[PDB]
């Protein structure tokens, strides 16, 4: 249905003259300070509901497929965490005993602080090395040295025992208690929103570049191939082909019990994702796998007569809470920052992937002050870095779970292990649960298929993602997301710089005004063209905007006025001796679609304005709706001859005025 | 005067069913790689042309006021390249002998090709602290260590000389080659829109550091205080504190010369600027003090008798070129790399200010290939790099200054000075030419008077302006320049991501629509609210724009879905047993300001309008142009029931449509 819109002309002055403004609230601090929560309790409340992130999922949680899936996928993500903690506090150069605790008490802290499901909190493999090489460089390796025990030439310097280990696991709790006062103290502040800048092709480069990492950290202890610590540059690389080199001391029985264990549950994972619907319950193969491998490795010695690796170093027992030492907390304090800052990162990638599989999206500040609690109860227990790995979150939510409750009955599930069920997790031949992780890692894996979707859709995104992937690849997880989220940032500033500028034109008998160089039957005023750059003019895309000018217009302004300049000393000359213009006569830019302008960009502007005024060609504008025009009239934008009046509300408006000015 | 545009409603399904797309031209390169230049000598002669900078202003120049301004100006600037280069060539630990021929060779070379005026080119502070400590680095300081001498104790381990020295010549003048062949191949890929990146802001606080900086330098001179070298991180404040604790060892001969000097220098220069209508051609005053200093210093002894400080030590001749040594170039390939790159940063800031006195916006590869090409002919001589000092383009344009004929009459004057006028300019007291520079440095001090003018005009330009000082003034302006940069392109992204959201309404019996938090007297449509975010919506502003949405329509869509459902299982068990929405009825997103989105934007926002729908509350669109369409169509935003005719081409359709849909 038509409509008749019969308007005067109005221009900037033209429309203000009529109308009212409003008088802007400058809202001083010294009379609203006290305007957030003063008296009344219903924000406080809500300030307290959302501080505990347990009074929103528990109370309202369905047990109808609850129990029994939480359950098995507890047990699972249990025995991958206890496996994990065995392995991390080796490689953490501490006594291996407190990898149950990382994975216990840091589980119940964050059952009830902390809303992001599908995530096991505990020991990470990088933080792990950072925080062994941060304790071997604030601790020397030989403490006293005793030099006793008769040796062969000279005093047998047996390295101490005891007071080393001791010393080594109290600066591991003094730099976790750091670590987590230190993630306590930048949620105070709420520096939330920078997981506002991790996108979900930033989160995948990411996760599948770490899922290769986990896929290799467990290749090489599958293969039981001594390999050197490596971080920083090239890690992964370094680790691949120190792997390929090391090939040949390789246990042929392990190596074969744990590809048929991988080919065997992946395939039963495979045939439940077919059977979903026959069977109701998603069988747990990995309690299955596990019992069969403890029985076939108790009833054969794998050990002592076939040297397939075990864990056979099952500790007993809890150890009450020391009091760390605060007279060091300073030195730690020079580096565990850096390393807190990537734990948290780490910590939101393993939510931001699945971010993209269920509709849970996530707060920063909350996870962080509940990252950094939790890591502070980790405090006083000798425990580990509140990290979280994506083996085990791969694990949980594959093999179904619903609700952090799967943490809870993992943690209870470590705690009944290491208080009565020690001697039944002997035998395990840390192959097959080496090899459940590279199962659900498939889930992951892929997530390399988006990539030809992605580039189908936005060329920019892909390139993103694959460029984060490398670089993480390279540069190693704790630098790769810092140079995916530099890239990324770069990307958007050049889409800011480099917009999509076209030559606009109306359509007949109408005052709908559509690109050109897109549509055809169009029709151009004579001598009036529209410009429409659709982008901020800022301080970078200057001399981009001045190109797009001259390159729409055919003519460049210095060049035609340097000419006409010196053809006018040509004929005056001559006189004093005896004797490319394109019939434009406008140009009204399209500037709508600014949303920010700077003091270089309103310099430019002008000058451009005073340039095409030089060569007799009228520069006009568009919809600048209410801000950049404040922002152009306070940087002295109109001085002496230019005023609103050449600025116009709608472009239709424009092209009537230059219509009938003549 | 009133126009008549009767139009029917039209959706973005109702506009091409009617009108024709154009066949994009995908453009393909492996018929079309041959179309840039082929046989057209119009392209040659003009890249020929653009080339070479010196046929531009040199067949243009005008006479009047060029010859004496210039010949004064390049004097000035002579000395004062002379008195830099006997510093730096002590200061990068090379005999004092070669930083004439830096200032004599590289000007020479730069003289035609480079179109930057007011740049003396020459040898830089910080990029000859580099040079030196790059040299040595990989030269010991002890070559042979000749132990003869008859020494009090042991042998006389005499420093080596002759070979120490020429070994030193050697690597700096392999080092000035390869960072002259590096710009070179940095400009062959034409990697020259970083210079897009550099604001005015960006620049003044670059410069205005760098003006302490050199003032610092100049003052640790006048004095006569022997201060440690310190580059990176906290430089000037430690030279500064260093100046202020060793101010003992001052003389006060040579202080009170520099006071009397730099207070009749700046005193003449203001009465120039007050009687520069009178006295057509402006004193040189620099060649007056200069001479006089050198008289009262010859006609008294300051050096042998007062301890003052004079030059002493002018060399004359030149030298053969000598070929480099080519099996090195591959170590300084490591490092001079880095320098080279800070190099031509500085190069550029020299220019850029002085883009904001004078219309000479300049190019940036044209720039980069100059100074690579003058540095590579630096090289086979044994020169310096071909960076520019600022005191020295300084005083070039406070001193007059056009063109830069300038720096070849500077030129011809350090030649005529190393081979005929060697002992004239002797006895000369250090003083007086480095008073000069602090002297013009008010052009470059008085720059910071635009802080209060930058922060009335537009808050976000003053607070980077003011960054980028004190960032550049505690990490040196190595670093100054790069933090600047990144937080001029977080200041862009943090104003493309938090833009001015506001909620729109139209102006009575018209189709005009502004916003309603600044005007008054407007209405509403009873139950149809506008929603402009005015900003791309990309993977940053998503929850921002959610933020938005649900603070202007009043609600928050998830919690009235929760509470709603929770209503309905009530009254569903309550019929079992026995027995805050506002009245908006749709909201239409003038989404018009958007130049580009993302995989997350689109994803965003068709939850965004699945979530609505779930509410029973429509959601609307606008102006989607051009390419913001195609590409929310292309990455599957329509699949079942979305449709391309929920969109509007102008905001009046849309309030029409849902005026006459109830």
Chains 1, 2 share one sequence.
Not at 179 to 189: C, D, K, S
Not at 298 to 325: D, H, Q, T
Not at 373 to 389: E, L, Y
Not at 443 to 472: E, H
Request: charged share 15%.
């Amino acid at each position: 249905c038509s409509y008749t819109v019969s308007r005067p002309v109005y221009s900037e002055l033209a429309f203000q003259q009529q109308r009212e403004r409003r008088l802007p609230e400058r809202r001083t601090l010294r009379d609203s300070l006290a305007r957030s929560c003063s008296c009344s309790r219903k924000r406080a409340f809500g300030v307290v509901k959302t501080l505990l992130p347990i009074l929103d999922w528990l109370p309202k949680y369905r047990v109808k497929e609850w129990l029994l899936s939480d359950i098995i996928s507890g047990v699972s993500t249990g025995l991958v965490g206890t496996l994990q903690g065995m392995a991390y506090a080796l490689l953490a150069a501490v006594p291996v005993q407190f990898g149950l605790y990382s994975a216990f008490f840091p589980i119940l802290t964050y059952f009830v602080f902390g809303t992001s499901r599908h995530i096991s909190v505990g020991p990470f493999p990088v933080v792990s090395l950072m925080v062994g090489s941060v304790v071997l460089s604030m601790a020397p390796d030989d403490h006293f040295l005793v030099p006793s025990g008769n040796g062969s030439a000279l005093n047998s310097t047996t390295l101490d025992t005891g007071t080393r280990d001791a010393a080594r696991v109290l600066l591991a709790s003094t730099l976790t208690l750091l670590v987590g006062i230190i993630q306590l103290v930048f949620g105070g502040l709420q520096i939330g929103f920078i997981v506002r800048y991790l996108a979900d092709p930033l989160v995948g480069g990411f996760t599948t570049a770490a899922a290769f990492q986990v896929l290799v950290s467990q290749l090489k202890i599958v293969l039981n191939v001594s390999t050197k610590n490596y971080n920083g540059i090239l890690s992964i690389i370094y680790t691949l082909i120190e792997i390929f080199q090391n090939i040949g001391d390789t246990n042929i029985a392990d190596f074969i019990a744990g590809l048929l264990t991988i080919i065997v549950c992946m395939a039963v994972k495979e045939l439940n994702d077919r059977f979903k619907h026959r069977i109701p319950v998603p069988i747990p193969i990995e309690v299955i796998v596990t019992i069969i491998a403890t029985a076939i490795s108790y009833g054969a010695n794998l050990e002592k007569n076939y040297n397939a690796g075990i864990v056979k170093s099952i500790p007993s027992g809890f150890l009450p809470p020391v009091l760390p030492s605060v007279g060091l907390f300073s030195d730690m304090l020079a580096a565990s920052f850096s390393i807190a800052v990537v734990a948290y990162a780490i910590a939101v990638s393993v939510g931001k992937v699945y971010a993209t599989k269920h509709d849970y999206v996530i707060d920063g500040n909350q996870e962080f002050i509940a990252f950094g609690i939790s890591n502070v109860f980790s405090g006083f227990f000798s425990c580990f870095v509140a990290t979280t790995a994506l083996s085990r979150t791969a694990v949980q939510e594959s093999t179904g779970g619903k609700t952090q409750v799967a943490g809870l009955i993992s943690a209870v599930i470590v705690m009944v292990a290491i208080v009565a069920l020690g001697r039944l997790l002997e035998p395990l031949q840390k192959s097959v649960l080496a090899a459940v992780v590279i199962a659900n890692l498939k889930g992951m894996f892929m997530q390399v298929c988006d990539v030809p979707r992605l580039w189908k859709q936005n060329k920019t995104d892909a390139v993103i993602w694959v460029f984060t992937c490398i670089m993480s690849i390279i540069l190693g997880l704790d630098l790769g997301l810092l140079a995916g989220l530099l890239f990324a940032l770069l990307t958007v500033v050049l889409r800011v710089q480099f917009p999509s500028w076209n030559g606009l034109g109306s359509v007949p008998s109408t005052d709908i005004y559509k690109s050109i160089t897109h549509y055809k039957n169009l029709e151009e005023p004579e001598g009036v063209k529209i410009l429409r750059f659709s982008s901020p003019i800022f301080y970078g895309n200057v001399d981009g905007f001045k190109k797009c000018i001259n390159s729409t217009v055919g003519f460049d302004a210095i060049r035609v006025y340097n000419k006409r300049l010196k053809a006018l000393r040509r004929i005056q000359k001559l006189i004093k001796k005896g004797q490319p213009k394109v019939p434009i006569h406008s140009l009204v830019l399209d500037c709508g679609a600014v949303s920010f302008l700077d003091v270089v960009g309103v310099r430019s502007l002008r000058m451009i304005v005073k340039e095409f005024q030089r060569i007799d060609v009228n520069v006009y504008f568009a919809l600048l709706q209410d801000d950049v025009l404040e922002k152009m009239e306070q940087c002295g934008f109109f001085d002496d001859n230019i005023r609103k009046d050449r600025f116009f509300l709608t472009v239709h408006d424009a092209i009537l005025h230059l219509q009938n000015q003549v």
